[PDB]
Structure formats: structure tokens, C-alpha cells
Design a protein around this nucleic acid. Structure first.
Ligand SMILES: O=C(O)CNC(=O)C(=O)O
Ligand SMILES: O=C(O)CNC(=O)C(=O)O
Ligand SMILES: O=C(O)CNC(=O)C(=O)O
Ligand SMILES: O=C(O)CNC(=O)C(=O)O
Ligand SMILES: [Mn+2]
Ligand SMILES: [Mn+2]
Ligand SMILES: [Mn+2]
Ligand SMILES: [Mn+2]
Lengths: 372, 381, 377, 378
DNA sequence: CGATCAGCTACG
DNA sequence: CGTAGCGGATCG
DNA sequence: CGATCAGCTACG
DNA sequence: CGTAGCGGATCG
């Protein structure tokens, strides 16, 4: 599969670049691969390398380990319960380093050097941001696409807060607010009992979702390369899971479609969700494995984006081009209303795909693995 | 059709000659057929029989199957990526029969087979008889000494660049062509009865531009070498008989069925003077060849290279076999061009190469399945 | 657990000695581990390293892959069908390296590999140090001199009968006629095992091993260093199989919900110095040409022959070979692929066969691994 | 796959037995195979050899070729049209060897070019195997809520609700009265196209999909009988036998030719037959017909059993009636030869082994032309 | 997302 | 006469 | 459909 | 003690 080869090249090249920035000997790309043939990809990798090196040089530490924090969590603690969240705040305080709105790349590590949060502002190069803007605009401006049909279905008529109307941007939008999800292997609502299959959004071979994916393979390669810089075992394990889902047709239904989607799937993650013109309340993401690091990319036409992490006592500037990697099941996070239109791409995981593929899900990486 | 009958009979006769060499009961050509009508072809078939039997008795094996190698290759992996080639070389090494401390240049006819007895490479030095080599030399000289043929027109088309590693257009890069004193104009021409323009595999195929003038230089070169092409086709039938017969069937369907090609009477006229089971033939005059894989043909296609000219130091390099092969005039090499990395450095003189290769979409159009590579034992049946 | 620690360390040390022999920088054992605690084991490992390196330098190749050979075999093709064996011999011949110009019997260490570098057969003559051979001779003698041990009790049970095919392993045609110091017969040992036809219950301890101080448990206690040696050899030939067998034993020891009578099985494992599933002792029996069909396709079995005989031969027809099979000789082979037999010898002989049960791997949740390629050692 | 090896061994051994009967040098089975290990199979092969050798010595010839007959037939001419059948009877008469009661001796009908069109084999099946088949069919037709009883109540319900295009399940044909075995029709196949789903990829027959349903265990009860039938076919038409085996191997190997290929592979693993399909017709009379759903060149095999005394199979274009009592085997080009079986004085079942050419096309295996009888004697 | 492609005729 | 403008699924 | 199976507790 | 009767998916 050449797509997985491309994502490997992006990841490896990004690592060489970061190493060059650290040693003072600049990496010079000579190999004849996709990176030399596509300056947009090369430039985007260079920008991500700059931001990642800066973030790796600015590390805050909380006075507890992710393991104990996760053991105090209940299996579906998403942050709606104020009593238990106060319990968490007292048992796992921010610590002396964290007792201001940040703008500089940084990361939060636990007492045993595990990365819980990586803040990367302006990680995505303007070319790729333009590309993503165009793709999302095409998906959210179609007349009878999934988003418009859902948008009129909801006008005719927490708990399922991800599609609550109070959270969507009300006023002037050229992009249709809503939420869509894409994955080569997914279990539909209350179909979790069966084998996984392709997401409905991706099932038409020339539907709006498949073309949206075809519009952003280089953005997805960039996001995957960032993940590989932060957690290489997780990147490689996701790639192995994808390879196994491709090979072994007895793990999915409609495996023809799953294999095609994988062929145009330039990402090590299990799934990608697009949230258009919706505020995000403080929450924990409960649907993935404890150990999964998700990646958020925000874009649009706004100036006052903020991401709030209360258990770190921090607010982070969350403007177009900003990338955030985080343990979504551990870190409470939210994004208030912005002064304009916004979209978010959330790249995340399904542990059940991992056991099905026979690939262990790894524990979060320590930051020192960066420097080997 | 006399062309397809001629090459079919040449193939069958060559097989009988090789079998006689194997059993010790010499074949003696008795039938009153086209092979009796051309003593030159018969002599050349005997020489090919000698060299083919020798190569069939000297077989190296790599410790992997072509099928797994191809599954690891990407569809357009031509060898430009050195890191990817290092991955390939470590996952599919030459094996104990082929690794050595020092680079080995072979001189004896041989073949490389995979772990499942499929032929990947066949080395046949001095396969072509002096007579047929003389003929080919004369025909290629006629093509490359012309005053306003395709070769000089191409040399002028690049005249703006000239007076001013693979990559786009490497087959005609000026870096590779012979600088100095040449009797034959360096360049590349290609011939085919049915063919698709680059990027245009969406229409119906048509005749190659070189062959469209009914008395142009290309059709006249083609008419000059029907017995050399019969010999090349017969060799192919010895290495991969199903591919030979399937190519012949494809040609027959393209000839008969007129709704498969554009300009079909021209395609039929070319097929009538097409003494070859292959889809296409390319003539490369005075050009070195860098290490590459040919990525545009079917995975399972066996291509045939014939080299000639007046040079003494010819070498063909196969890195994934850890081998260099003496590649002097008259040498024939059959190889899975989409699997085998191969290149030819500059020689100390003038050289030309005839590359016979395939287009799977022609097989699809003709309704003929493309077969999987032959096992060597099928020769011995 | 000292059993698994001893065999793991023996395997690692043997690998280091073989590596030193290959590079020319001799391994020198400095660590304070199990190997220093047993100089006899260390000596035997050095001898095995020498013979293994010699065998690795003398490699014959068959012109086919084990995968294609096995795909043409039927799951219980033991060699009884002469037509089917002719089919196999014609479709999978010995090849040019094996058929043309060698002696009546081989005497030098060697191995047969397939077209994809997988090991099919490893001939290792004089592999066992004389000390360990003495030890095994004594333990097998102790098992075969008892009044009313299992060996004598089965010899009596064949009463009126005396006055391939089912039960060939104990056919009377094969056992030594005359006067024997050792009682001919067959015994089998395993920490977890299924009775024939009963792979539908939980596995339990081998019958021979259940008395806490019976003859079988003391034969096991007498040969821990011979078993550690055999296990280390196996790890040199197929490292994934060694480590996976060790994991299976570890799971059977830990997880008590896999076994019946799990305390007893735990004791057996504690004195089980071997990664193999099971061990069979064949005393004074010739062996007809056969394939062992009951184990996993990819399982490497190990045969050890001993006794006081001079004309021992192991016949592998599909390799066109006869191998000198005298006391101290070790043979590793894919029992499901390689036809092999041992004719009657001019004296008394015993064989220790170490082999596998794939259902054990399934029960322990450990996948059965693919055979290693020979270069990986 | 050991199943295909078993049927190959049965075919080869049967041929050796027939050769021994012809030369006068009896075959002696020495090989250590399934035939030596199973005396029931060996005895049954011996009986089939006796009857087949007798049938090959009694050959009638019609004065036309099967090819011209098929060329004059229309693609769905099943015999319902009396005008077309009168035309066929004038253009292809029985001929001087056949025009002129009920035959009882094993025989065969060949065409003007020695192709076998019909082989009559009375008491071909050994009593042991007939007992076995009786028991398996009785088990199939007595299951409490199995396919046959659910069909039969679907039939009573529709007859009651009322106050050929589906003649094979027409209610007039089934035995009315006292039956131990539930009348009906079932069909089994590893690769099959359901009604309404004939432009999809082939898949396993509905009857065989439950891994321990009544259909799969009926198949598990009669592998030795299925091996016997395949061996008979291999004696009459060896290329067809071997081509059916090749099609089965391709369907087993190539997982992209079928849906639910897991199930198809399991079924193939217990499919002891070179035929594409097997149908069981329990307690049903059979009107004169041609079978139109198979390849023109396909030779089907019928095995009849039960407890009846007056069984007859009618072939009008040969001007013949054939005694069709329990144990009788008939091989015939069902798409060419009109044939029918009247109601009998008791309970009866029929096992019909037949072909689907589309499976051969999918597997890339040509369907061969019917064998000539002389191929037996090579 | 820029590049790949064993080439060609329409047309200045 | 020469050469511009393809042409389009797919490749890393 | 009879045979295979590197064996064993339940019990006269 | 000694040994009868398993035991069941699968093999040709
Ligand atoms: O909307 C954003 O920027 C962040 N979104 C999330 O964390 C989410 O949807 O789970
Ligand atoms: O130049 C040679 O002899 C060989 N040439 C090639 O393989 C080629 O042009 O693709
Ligand atoms: O007797 C020997 O030395 C070898 N024995 C075997 O292979 C066996 O019992 O299966
Ligand atoms: O019922 C019988 O014996 C014969 N049956 C058939 O020919 C049939 O159903 O097509
Ligand atoms: Mn979230
Ligand atoms: Mn080439
Ligand atoms: Mn054995
Ligand atoms: Mn019928």
C-alpha cells in the first residue's frame, strides 16, 4: 500500500528534521520519495518540526502519574459530575509548576515523564490550512449533503451534547454547522454487537465524504507524522492495525469497501471526526482506550479561540492552524464560542479495532523517546 | 497468417531441438514447413537451442517467491528510492547461492528461479547467430543513418536544450546518450501494431506513429528483421510458453476483430508483418541504461532484451541478484522487467538494444487472460 | 521458577557460544547464573555448540518449500500409502544437491533446508557430552530394571497375543527379540496431556508422572540437565518455538483454570526442564518409516538415541539419505514432513522423542509460531 | 483435501475392477487406502463394477447424433409442447435397433457417433449402502420441524386455502396416503444461486448453511454412497468427473468466486461428489420431462430407493421402459433424454446428481462433451 | 498534491 | 513542417 | 463409514 | 491389583 508508505516517509522525515534542529546540523532531504516530489508536504513537515522542537523544550510536570489518575477515573467519567470532578481536582492537583493564556508551544508530562498534552499553535502551514478550508467548505456548502439534511432535521424538531443545537454557531455561517465521522472500520449506533464495517459517510465511492478524504490526504499525512513524533509505538501500531484490516477480510463486513477506503486512508488513526461551527464544553472523551492520544486541528475565520484545561489550570490560544495532542480520556478540555466560523478535525482511536487486528494498544510514550 | 504460423513453427521446432539436446536423441528437422524455407532461421534456432539448454542446466535460486516480492513492491516502484530499495534488499536478499565477498561478473548462460521454480531472469550470451546479427546491424544502421528520419528529428527537437538517477523522461535524457563519434544517431524509437499514447489509455489503441507510413522508415525496419523477431519469439516460447501462446492469441484477435483498434486496416497490415508475440518493441540506439524497473507492463510479463553493435565491454547489472553479466553483441536476456532491477553502463563503442515487452490492457481488450509466469520444469514436459 | 530459568539461560549461553564460534571471538562465560552452577551443563553446551556450528556449515537444500510440501500432504499422511508417497517423491524430489555423489551413510553434522531457508532436518552425531550420556544411560536403566514398573506391567499385559497400522509404536514385531537388560517398551511423560480421543476435557498430568515418588517422577528428576541441553539445542534451531513453548508452560503453571489436578501439574512443571509439550521414551524398539502426524505442522521435534549398539541408522527417503545414528546422536526434524525410520540395531537402544501438542498452545492462549529461518540464529 | 482423494481412489479402484472383469484377471486390492480400510465401500465398488461391465456389453444405437438433436432443440424445451415433441419424434426416431417389454438387463444407448446418452444400471448399489441411504433419508424426512415437514404443511395450507411452472413441487405428484417419509424436494450444493438472486455470486445452499442442521448431517450420513455415485460417473465419463473435481478445487481455493466462502469451504470439505448439486425427491411421481437448467452436455445420475415393487423409468425417444426398482442407477443426458417415473406401489425416494455450467465458467474449467463408450476400454 | 507515463495527432 | 497540449487513474 | 489416535480413570 | 471402555473430530 503506497498510502502507508507515504505516511511512513512523512513521519521519518519529520523525525530527521527535528533531530537536525536539535543538533544544529540541518537535515537536507536528498532521497527520491514523495517528500521531494511535493513541496507542500515538505514545507508542512518543516513547520511541524519547528513547532514540535519548541514544544519539546518547554515541559511542565504535574505531581501525579497518568496511571493513578486513570485508576481513579470511572469508565465513563466525561466531566458532567461536579462532585467526582472536585474529587479529581483534590486528589490530582495542578502542582507547583502550574498554580495566564499560553501562546508558546509546550507539553504537560506526568510524574514519570509520560506526555499527557502537547500544545503546538500554528503547527499547520498556511498552504495546508487553505487546502483544508477549501475541502471543509465544499463539504459544508453542498445543498443536500449529510450536514444540510441533519441541519434541517434538527430544526424541525450532557447527553448527546455533540449534536446539541445550543453549541452550534448561530448567526452568519457560510459553512453548515454539524458533525460527521469517517472511518474505514466502524460500528454503527447500536450495531456494536456485529463485526466492524465502513462508515456510512464513506460508503458511496464518489460521495461527499470519500471526496472530502481525497481532498486532504497530505493534511492527514501531516497529522500522522506529528503523532509519530509524539508517540512512535502508537503510530506504528495504528499502521499495523490498518494493514491487518486490509489483509484479513474476515474482520470486517463489506471488506471490498473497507479495503478501498484504507487505500485512500492517509492516517494511522482509527477514525476522524469533523465538527463544523460548534462550541465544545469541557469534557473527557470516553469512547477510546485509556491510553489513546487524540489529535485536534482547528481552523476557520476566527480570532479568539481558546482551549481550556482546568486540571492543568491553563488556557491555550486556539486559533486557526493550532494542533493539540492530548489523552482525551484523561484531560478535561473544552472550546468556547469563537468570533466567527470554526471547524475542528479530531483524530482518534477505537481499541476494539486493535484487539480485532491482534495488535496490542501501547501505553503513552515518555518524552525522552523523542531524543533517542 | 504467415507471421504467426512462422513464429509458432519456430517455437515448436526450437522446443524439439532443446528436447533432443536433453535426451541425447538429436532432433533432425524433417517437416516441409517455414523452417525448412529459411536455413538462416534454422541455424539460428540451433544456436539458441544450444545456449538455452546450457542456461537451463545452470540455475540459481533466490530464497523467496516472485509473488511475495511483487506483493511488497508498489505499482510504480522503479528503483528511484534508495531507502525503499534497501528495505527490499534486506527483506528479499540474493540468498546463499548468489552472495559473495567480491562482485561476480558471469559469462556462462544461466537463469535465476524463485523458491517456487518460476523463472525471473535468463542469461543467454552469444544466442544470436552471426548471420542474424549482421542482418540486425544493417537494419539498425539503415534506421540510424537516415538523413531526415525520426532519430535526427528527435535530435533537433532537443537541440534547444542541448547547447544550453532516473526521473521524468530518463529514456531519452541527453546525459545517457553517446557523446563523441557515432555512425548511428543516438535515440529511441518504439513500434507496436496496437498502442496507447501516454495518458491516453482511455480511448481505443492504434498503430504506433513509427509504423503508420506504409513505406516509412519504421515499417521498412520492421520488414527488414522478421527472422530475428521470429527467433526472439521462439526463445520466449521456450522460457514461458503460455505467455507466448496468449500473446499470439491477442494478436490474432486484434487482427480479426476490427472493433478493438482505431485505424484497423493499418493495424492489420502491421500485424501481418509483425513476426513477434510481444505487444511492443523499442530500439534504443547509443544510450547507456541506468538501474531501473520497467513499471508500465503486467507484473507477470517476461521481457526480452537483445543487444548489438561494435563494443567489447558490455555489462548488465542486476543488484538484487548480486550479479553483473557480460552483455556483449549477440547476447539475449529474458527477465521480469517489473521485478528485476537492471541497467547497462556506457560501453567503449556504439551499441543498440531491442527491448520486447508487453501491454496488459491489450490482453484485456482481446479477451485473453494474462497468464502467471512459467515454472522452468514445464520446458522438460 | 528454576526450570524455566535454567532452560532460558542455557539457550542464551548456547547462542552466545555459537556466535563466538562464528565470528572468531570466543564467548567466555563470566555471568553468575545457572550455567556456572552446573559445569556439566556448560561442558555439554560447548560440545553442542561445536556440533551445531559444523552442521550449520554443511547445508543441503531441497528444490521445494516446506509450505508447498505440507499443502500437498493430507493431515494424517503417515506414509502407509505407497501410491501417495510415490506422488510426493515425484512432485518433491531430493534435488541435485542431495541425489548426486555422497556416501552410503552420512557421519558428518549437517542440515537440510528448503527453498526458503527453513530447516527441515538437523543431523548432529555425537552432540551429547559422555557425562550426560552416562547420566541418561543410568536413568533409563533405572526405569527399565524395575520389577513391576510400567515397562514390565505393559510387557505382561501383552500375554496371549504373543502365544504401520494402529498401535505400531508398540507392535511386537518391532521390539528386540532375545535377552535384554532393559525391558523393551514405550513410556510417555507430559505435565499436561490429553488421553487419546479425549481432547474435549481439560488436560491433566501424564499417568506416569502422577505418583509423587513413582518411577516416572524420579526419572524426570534424574535428567534435568539432559533436558536443559535438548531445550537449548531447540532454541538454536527455532527460537520462536522455544520461547512460545516456554510461555505455554508459564501459562499452564500460572493459570489454574486450564488444567485438571493443577497442583500436580504445577509440581511437574517445576521439575520440567524442557520447552516441549511431551517426551516419549522408546526402549529397544526399531522404528519403521513414518511421519508423526499428531503434532502441529511447523513443530520441530528432537530425537536423542542412546544405548550400546554399533550400527545405528536413521533413514530419510525423501532426502535420499541414511544417517549414522549411534549413541549420543541428536536429530531435529519436522516430524510432520520428514519420513524417518530406524532399523533394528545390534544391541540395546533407547530413544527420547521431544514433541508438541498444538492444543496446548491454544489452551494457553499462545499462538503457534512460524518456523525460523536458519540465518536468524 | 482428503474427501477428493477418497473419491479419486474410489474411481480408480472401480476402473481397475472393471478392467479385471474384462480381461479375466481379477483385480486384487493391495494398496493401504480408504478402500482397504472400508469393506462397505469396497463391496459397493465391486457391485458397481459387475453391473457396469454388464451394461457396456449391451449397447443400442440410435440413428442420429446427440449434437444434431441438441442443435434442433430449443433452450427450454422440457417436453411440455406436444407439437415440438412430435417434430422431435419424427426427426430423431428410435431406429431399427430400438423400434418395436420393460427392460431388465444393464445396457446403454449410444448415438450414431458412439456417445453415451443413457446408461441403465439395475441393482447397481450394494444392499448395505441402500440400507445406509434409506436410514439417512428417513432421518431427513422425520425431523420434527425440518424443511420437509414445513414444506408439506405449506402445501396442505395452500391446498386448503384454494378452497407446469413448478411441477417439481406440484401437489398432484406427491404420494397421497400413508407415508413414513414426508414427501417433498430438497437441494444441496456448496455453490448455488437462489431464486431472485441469480445475478449475484454463487453461495452455499440454504439447506446446508446450519453447520449442524438436518441438511449438513444428511450429507455426513452418506459420503460412501456419494463416493460410489462419483466413481460410477468416472467410469462412464472420466473427463467430466475430473473436470467436476477441478471446479470443486477452484471453488475451495479461490475465495472470490462465492459469497460466504467460509461455509462453502467447509461444505466442499464434506462434499464427496464431483457433481455441482444433489437433489433429494421424497415420495413424488415424476412426469416425462427434460431437465433444462443444466449444461446440454451434462450427464446426470439418478439413484432410486424405497420399498416398492413396480418402479419404471420411461424413455419415449428410445421406445423403452426400464425396470426402476430400489438400488437402480441411471446415468443420462437429462437435457436431451425425455424421462419420467410413474407412481409406485409404496414409498420411494430419488437422489439426482446434476451440474451447473456457470460454476465451470467461474472456475475457468471447460465443460466437456459427453464421452464415447470406447473410452471405457482404453 | 505534484508527478507518472517506453506517445501522439491537431493545427499554427 | 514542427510541436502544444494533452490525458486520467493512481502513486508515494 | 470403519479407522485414527505418541492415553487413561473408573472399577470388577 | 489389572484392564474395559471410552472419546470425538476428522480422515481417506
Ligand atoms: O471543538 C474542538 O476544538 C475540540 N473538540 C473536542 O475535543 C471534541 O469534539 O471531543
Ligand atoms: O539498454 C539495454 O540494453 C537494456 N535497456 C532496458 O532495459 C530499457 O531501456 O528499459
Ligand atoms: O526410534 C527412534 O530413534 C526414532 N523414533 C521415532 O521417530 C518415533 O518413535 O516416532
Ligand atoms: O424421480 C425420479 O426417480 C427421477 N427424477 C427426475 O428425473 C427429476 O426430478 O428430474
Ligand atoms: Mn474531546
Ligand atoms: Mn528496462
Ligand atoms: Mn517419529
Ligand atoms: Mn430429471
Amino acid at each position: 500500500l503506497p498510502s502507508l508508505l507515504l505516511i511512513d516517509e512523512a513521519a521519518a522525515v519529520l523525525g530527521r528534521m527535528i533531530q537536525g534542529l536539535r543538533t544544529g546540523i540541518p537535515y537536507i532531504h536528498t532521497e527520491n520519495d514523495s517528500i521531494k516530489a511535493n513541496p507542500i508536504l515538505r514545507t508542512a513537515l518543516w513547520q511541524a518540526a519547528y513547532v514540535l522542537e519548541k514544544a519539546y523544550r518547554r515541559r511542565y510536570r504535574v505531581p501525579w502519574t497518568a496511571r493513578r489518575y486513570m485508576r481513579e477515573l470511572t469508565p465513563r467519567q466525561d466531566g458532567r459530575n461536579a462532585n467526582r470532578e472536585a474529587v479529581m481536582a483534590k486528589e490530582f492537583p495542578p502542582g507547583a509548576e502550574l498554580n495566564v493564556q499560553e501562546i508558546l508551544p509546550a507539553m504537560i508530562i506526568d510524574a514519570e515523564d509520560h506526555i499527557l498534552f502537547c500544545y503546538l499553535p500554528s503547527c499547520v502551514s498556511p498552504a495546508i490550512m487553505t487546502i483544508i478550508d477549501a475541502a471543509v467548505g465544499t463539504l459544508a456548502t453542498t445543498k443536500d449533503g449529510h450536514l444540510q439534511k441533519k441541519s434541517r432535521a434538527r430544526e424541525g424538531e450532557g447527553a448527546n451534547w455533540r449534536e446539541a443545537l445550543d453549541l452550534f454557531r448561530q448567526g452568519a455561517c457560510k459553512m453548515t454547522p454539524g458533525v460527521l465521522t469517517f472511518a474505514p472500520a466502524w460500528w454503527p449506533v447500536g450495531h456494536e454487537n456485529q463485526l466492524p464495517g465502513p462508515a456510512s459517510t464513506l460508503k458511496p465511492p464518489k460521495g461527499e465524504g470519500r471526496m472530502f478524504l481525497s481532498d486532504i490526504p497530505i493534511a492527514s499525512a501531516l497529522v500522522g507524522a506529528i503523532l509519530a513524533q509524539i508517540n512512535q509505538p502508537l503510530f506504528e501500531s495504528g499502521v499495523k492495525v490498518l494493514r491487518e484490516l486490509y489483509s484479513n477480510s474476515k474482520l470486517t463486513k463489506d471488506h471490498s469497501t473497507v479495503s478501498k477506503i484504507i487505500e485512500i486512508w492517509f492516517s494511522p488513526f482509527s477514525s476522524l471526526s469533523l465538527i463544523v461551527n460548534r462550541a465544545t464544553p469541557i469534557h473527557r472523551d470516553t469512547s477510546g482506550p485509556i491510553e489513546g492520544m487524540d489529535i485536534l486541528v482547528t481552523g476557520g475565520n476566527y480570532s479568539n479561540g481558546v482551549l481550556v484545561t482546568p486540571s492543568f489550570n491553563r488556557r491555550w490560544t486556539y486559533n486557526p492552524g493550532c494542533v493539540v495532542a492530548l489523552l482525551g480520556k484523561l484531560v478535561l478540555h473544552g472550546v468556547p464560542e469563537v468570533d466567527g466560523e470554526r471547524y475542528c478535525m479530531a483524530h482518534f482511536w477505537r481499541e476494539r479495532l486493535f484487539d480485532a487486528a491482534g495488535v496490542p494498544f501501547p501505553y503513552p510514550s515518555k518524552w525522552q523517546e523523542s531524543y533517542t
